[PDB]
Amino acid sequence: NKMEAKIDELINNDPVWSSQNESLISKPYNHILLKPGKNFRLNLIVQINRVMNLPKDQLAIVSQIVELLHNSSLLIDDIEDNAPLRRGQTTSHLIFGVPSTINTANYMYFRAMQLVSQLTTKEPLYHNLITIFNEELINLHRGQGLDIYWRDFLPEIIPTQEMYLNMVMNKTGGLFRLTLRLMEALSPSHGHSLVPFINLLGIIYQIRDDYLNLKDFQFAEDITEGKLSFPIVHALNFTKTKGQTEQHNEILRILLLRTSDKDIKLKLIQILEFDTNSLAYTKNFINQLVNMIKNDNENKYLPLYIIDHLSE
Amino acid sequence: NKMEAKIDELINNDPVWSSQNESLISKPYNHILLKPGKNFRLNLIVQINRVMNLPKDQLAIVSQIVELLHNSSLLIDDIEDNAPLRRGQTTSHLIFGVPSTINTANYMYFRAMQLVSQLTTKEPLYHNLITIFNEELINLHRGQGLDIYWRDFLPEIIPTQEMYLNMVMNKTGGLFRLTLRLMEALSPSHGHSLVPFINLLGIIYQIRDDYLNLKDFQFAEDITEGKLSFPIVHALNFTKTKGQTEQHNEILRILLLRTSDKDIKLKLIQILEFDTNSLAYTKNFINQLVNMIKNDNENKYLPELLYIIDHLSE
Ligand SMILES: CC(C)=CCC/C(C)=C/CC/C(C)=C/CC/C(C)=C/COP(=O)(O)OP(=O)(O)O
Ligand SMILES: CC(C)=CCC/C(C)=C/CC/C(C)=C/CC/C(C)=C/COP(=O)(O)OP(=O)(O)O
Ligand SMILES: [Mg+2]
Ligand SMILES: [Mg+2]
Ligand SMILES: [Mg+2]
Ligand SMILES: [Mg+2]
């Protein structure tokens, strides 16, 4: 009687979800929102909108979509990379646990997917925005997948610089392209697509990220992670090309230690500085990429300041 | 200059991805594919199609979408639940690592999303299909979120039976409704919606999953997990209501040990058998839910099915 009646009412209604339940699942996400950098991504979307011209509130939704995807991808990335810190603050999984952090990050990817339907009610356009969203999230995961595979199967595969760049086009290029492609699709206005420029921005951003992780130290957490970062990939291929067997193996040994020992981390930085000159090689490489934009007098890529502060 | 030429070529082309790359990152997923269950899920989809009549090619895609979703959900649930085994086999994260397993499962959620486009060439219907897919994946994550939070922050929140059933309507009900709603949306045909029946199947499935995890032991891994299972929720509320302070606290202590000790697990199960009578309560609750369908002569919930209902665990 009463039990069957309560069951019948339950199965005939939509699943129950409260604002309190929403606050509970949002805790790991709210924690990363404390991290700085929002001002900066906001600025890049604003500046690109000088070309695209989306109306303010449509731009607001693109921005929210991008923020959810970026933050969620970093919450998961930190679990994948066993990262203890992100922008100087403790990572969410060390506070709320890996289980809630993964579930919340995933939930926010689906909340971002839902916000796409609010960019437009035109069916054909909507289909195109969801396809952009789906394609670039697929690319991001393919790229992350390779980054993780090389790291976790090392020394099975040592990537070449070309392989690394293709991984970055997928991994870091994904959200850069997603944000821009959504904006170019919604533009009510503009010229050649800016996807090439934004691919270049993504490459520069990732090589700089990998470089600064080591250069600031010289926490160099990337060494503890065992990551096949741009300078590491240069150093492994360089020692291999030169027949520098012992040095090649010592770089591999230190990466495989997954060490937090400052003195050992410093020894790998010494190899990269004195033996392969990989940090200077990387500095020069980022400069060359940046100059491709600085000297784009014919605006083949462009439609300064952002590019220089790209790391934040 | 050759550097510029190469960078220019790279940024002017789609990102490079090979079939070898695809194979290497699919490892965690290929491994769970070795587990049984596929035939059973295909059987429930087949029976419901006797009502929905989708053409075979189209039913095949629905089935592929749901399978990718189901499998990716389990890869991730096992990481969340620190599970060593799934269907008698070692779980993927123990073999390939949590990093690859999480990324591959999430990749497969997006591959499933991609497959929705192959169900129709009509934009208005497509939007509906994507909405269904999005809504039920949101529900699944909301339910999973409560299940995890209650367990990992215990005793912050002791859920009631009512709370547990709402978490299940979200968690377990999510994929059952996703499959059924995609089918009802694509039907070219068929009576009242089967959503209420599918919600009941989800609840029966989950409470039976919880019950059997303890009754086949009586490896009771749910105790090691610390899960707020249907019998554990009944025991915790029964003890509080009855003033069994020590037993209420002992249930919490055992759940918090995250123990693999078989005798500590058996002590808890026997507290549920004899002190709170949670096992009998759960068996009876399951039977009552199943009878709501077996005694549905007017076909108010119902549109073979009964066979699936008794083998729902598979
Ligand atoms: C293009 C426009 C208009 C705006 C940009 C909008 C966004 C979201 C920019 C940021 C995109 C971004 C930085 C994506 C990469 C996120 C990712 C997958 C990180 C994980 O890779 P790691 O190499 O582990 O990164 P960390 O070094 O931070 O741990
Ligand atoms: C409705 C039709 C036609 C078919 C059904 C098709 C499917 C996919 C059925 C199964 C759906 C199902 C059982 C989903 C639950 C997946 C999930 C979120 C599991 C995680 O929860 P736990 O409670 O940890 O489960 P375990 O006990 O298996 O670890
Ligand atoms: Mg990282
Ligand atoms: Mg990473
Ligand atoms: Mg589980
Ligand atoms: Mg679970």
CA distance A52 to B288: 60
Nearest to A166 by CA among B12, B17, B9, B23: B17
Residues with CB under 6 A from ligand 1: A 41, 44-45, 48, 66, 70, 73-74, 77, 81, 140, 144, 171-172, 175-176, 179-180, 198, 205, 209
How many residues would you count in chain A? 312
DSSP assignment letter at B216: T
DSSP string covering A259-303: ---HHHHHHHHHIIIIIS-HHHHHHHHHHHHHHHHHT-TT-SS--
Q: Choose among B25, B107, B145: nearest Cβ to A25.
A: B145
Please list the residues that pair with B88 across neighbouring strands.
Answer: none
Residue A194's contacts (CB-CB under 8 Å, 6 or more residues apart) are A48, A51, A180, A184, A303
What values do phi and psi take at A85, rounded to 5? -140, 150
Residue A224's contacts (CB-CB under 8 Å, 6 or more residues apart) are A82, A258, A259, A260, A265
CA distance A86 to A212: 14
Q: Please report residues of B whose CB lies closer than 8 A to that of A16.
A: 166, 169
Q: Please report residues of A whose CB lies closer than 8 A to that of B159.
A: none
CA distance A282 to A200: 15
Q: Which residues surround ligand 6, an ion (CB under 5 A)?
A: B 77, 81
Q: Report how far ligand 3's centroid is from the alpha carbon of A267 (Å).
A: 22
Structural domain boundaries, residue A119: 1-312
CA distance A26 to A239: 47
| Contact: A152, B97; criterion CB under 8 Å | yes
Distances (CA, A) of A41 to A71, A73, A286, A307, B127: 12, 15, 20, 12, 30
DSSP string covering B86-140: ETTEE-HHHHH-HHHHHHHHHHHHHHHHHHGGGS-S-HHHHHHHHHHHHHHHHHH
**Crossing angle of helices B230-242/B278-294, nearest 10°?**
120
What values do phi and psi take at B6, rounded to 5? -70, -45
CB B43 within 8 A of CB B308: yes
Q: B85: part of which helix (H) or strand (E)?
A: strand B85-86
Please tell me whether residue B187 adopts helix, strand or coil conformation: coil
By C-alpha distance, the chain B residue nearest A73 is B103
Owner of token pair 């699943």? A15
Pocket test for ligand 2, best of B58, B65, B77 (most atoms within 8 A of CB): B77
CA distance B285 to B67: 29
Strands, DSSP E only, in chain A? 85-86, 89-90
Pairing of strands B89-90, A85-86: unpaired
CB A233 within 8 A of CB A164: yes
CB B255 within 8 A of CB B243: no
What values do phi and psi take at A146, rounded to 5? -65, -40
Structure tokens at B35: 């587990």
Nearest to B72 by CA among B113, B20, B40: B113
CA distance A107 to B137: 8
CATH number of the domain residue B89 falls in: 1.10.600.10
Question: Can you give the three-state secondary structure of B240-276, one letter per residue?
Answer: HHHCCHHHHHHHHHHHHHCCCCHHHHHHHHHHHHHHC
Rg of chain B taking only CA atoms, in angstroms:
22
Residue A30's contacts (CB-CB under 8 Å, 6 or more residues apart) are none
Cis ω before B28 (30° cut-off from 0): no
Please list the residues that pair with B86 across neighbouring strands.
Answer: B89
DSSP string covering A30-49: HHHHTSS-HHHHHHHHHHHH
CB A231 within 8 A of CB A272: yes
CB B217 within 8 A of CB B83: no
Pairing of strands A89-90, B85-86: unpaired
How many residues would you count in chain B? 314
CB A171 within 8 A of CB A144: yes
Structure tokens at A188: 């009510």
Q: Please report residues of A whose CB lies closer than 8 A to that of B111.
A: 138
CB B183 within 8 A of CB B49: yes
Please list the residues that pair with B90 across neighbouring strands.
Answer: B85
CB A307 within 8 A of CB A201: yes
Rama region for A258: left / alpha / beta (φ>0; ψ in -120 to 50; rest): left
| Contact: B107, A25; criterion CB under 8 Å | no
CA distance A82 to A25: 22
What values do phi and psi take at B86, rounded to 5? -140, 120
DSSP string covering B49-69: HHHH---HHHHHHHHHHHHHH
CA distance B101 to B26: 9
Pocket test for ligand 1, best of A179, A186, A224, A301 (most atoms within 8 A of CB): A179
| Cα dihedral sign, B185-B188-B193-B198 | negative
Question: Can you give the three-state secondary structure of B290-304, one letter per residue?
Answer: HHHHHCCCCCCCCCC
CB A207 within 8 A of CB A283: no
| Contact: A3, B134; criterion CB under 8 Å | no
CA distance B147 to A49: 42
CA distance A32 to A53: 30
Number of domain units in chain B: 1
CB B94 within 8 A of CB B75: no
Residue B140's contacts (CB-CB under 8 Å, 6 or more residues apart) are B73, B170, B171, B174, B175
| Cα dihedral sign, B147-B151-B155-B161 | positive
Binding residues of B for isopentenyl diphosphate: 38, 41, 70, 87
**Distance from CA of residue B266 to its chain's centroid?**
26
Count the neighbouring beta carbons within 10 Å of the beta carbon of residue A67.
18
CA distance A220 to B188: 60
| Contact: B166, A16; criterion CB under 8 Å | yes
What values do phi and psi take at B154, rounded to 5? -60, 140
Structure tokens at B23: 């194979």
Measured CA angle at A4 (ends B279, B228), to 5 deg: 40
Amino acid, single-letter form, for residue A98: V
What values do phi and psi take at A226, rounded to 5? 85, 20
CB B68 within 8 A of CB B28: no
CB B135 within 8 A of CB A107: no
CA distance A142 to A208: 21
CA distance B80 to B91: 12
Dihedral in degrees, nearest 10, Cα atoms A212, A217, A218, A223: -80
Query: What's the reported resolution, in angstroms, to a tenth?
Result: 1.9
Q: How was this structure determined?
A: X-ray
Structure tokens at A132: 């952009």
Q: Choose among B15, B104, B144: nearest Cβ to A103.
A: B144
Structure tokens at B128: 């509906």
Residue B222's contacts (CB-CB under 8 Å, 6 or more residues apart) are B210, B213, B214, B229, B232
Nearest to A76 by CA among A308, A122, A68: A68
Cis ω before B303 (30° cut-off from 0): no
Measured CA angle at A166 (ends A160, A167), to 5 deg: 90
Q: B152: part of which helix (H) or strand (E)?
A: helix B123-152
